[PDB]
């Protein structure tokens, strides 16, 4: 298939809400071009494909995890074991989806990146999928995933700060997810808040230099920073 075509089928599939197929097409795009870089359009498409495929399983896993422990509290052993094998099956899928994109990041996407925006986008993306592993892993697979997440987010942060404006949506999205990582995985509400509020304040101090469309782009991710901050900080 042509690469206008694989993008095309990726778009087709996004509209059919057939997200694994969207991943497949976009994948063939990501591999086809070498250390020549996806465009913005395609790089967003890929992210969205995988975000929707992982997202469904993350939702399933939370529901099933929440049922698991509640049934543990009641002592329904027969149920719990059923539930566990079922969770296992979901976690097998999570691992496969994460491995998929993590392998593609390490081999193609991250080392192909020449520009700051791309380097930050894909290192953040690498942080994301390690973070998703850490959500459901345990013990020492979990602390291994949390380490990989730290290292990727950090390098992303270092590069964003050197090169990207504090109002840049990619820099803002990086700050957003790094904070969530502190909150949900590391259980550090203060660090989470501090990191989000820093990013939010740096952007605020430039928001009014922006043209209109750029302002609207930034404000989208600033709203998310703001709402999290309001939530973590609420009575």
């Amino acid at each position: 298939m042509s690469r206008e075509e694989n993008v095309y089928m990726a778009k087709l599939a996004e509209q059919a809400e057939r997200y694994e197929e969207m991943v497949e097409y976009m994948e063939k795009v990501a591999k086809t071009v070498d250390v020549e870089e996806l465009t913005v359009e395609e790089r967003n498409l890929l992210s969205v494909a995988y975000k929707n495929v992982i997202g469904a399983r993350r939702a399933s896993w939370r529901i099933v995890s929440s049922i698991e422990q509640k049934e543990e509290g009641r002592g329904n052993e027969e149920h719990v074991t059923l539930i566990k094998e079922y969770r296992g099956k979901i976690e097998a899928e999570l691992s496969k989806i994460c491995d998929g994109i993590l392998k593609l990041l390490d081999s193609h996407l991250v080392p192909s990146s020449t520009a700051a925006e791309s380097k930050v986008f894909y290192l953040k993306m690498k942080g994301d999928y390690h973070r998703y592993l850490a959500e459901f892993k345990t013990g020492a697979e979990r602390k291994e995933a949390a380490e990989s997440t730290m290292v990727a987010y950090k390098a992303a942060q270092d590069i964003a700060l050197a090169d990207l404006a504090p109002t840049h949506p990619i820099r803002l999205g990086l700050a957003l997810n790094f904070s969530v990582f502190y909150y949900e995985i590391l259980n550090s509400p203060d660090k989470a808040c501090n990191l989000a509020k820093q990013a939010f304040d740096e952007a605020i101090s430039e928001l009014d230099t922006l043209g209109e469309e750029s302002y609207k782009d930034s404000t989208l991710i600033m709203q998310l920073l703001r709402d999290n901050l309001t939530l973590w900080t609420s009575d």
């Binding site: 967003n44 992210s47 953040k124 999205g173 990086l174 957003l176 997810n177 909150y183 709402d227």
Partner: peptide, 7 residues
């Protein structure tokens, strides 16, 4: 509704 980036 703890929330992440749309990308």
């Amino acid at each position: 509704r703890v929330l992440s980036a749309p990308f």
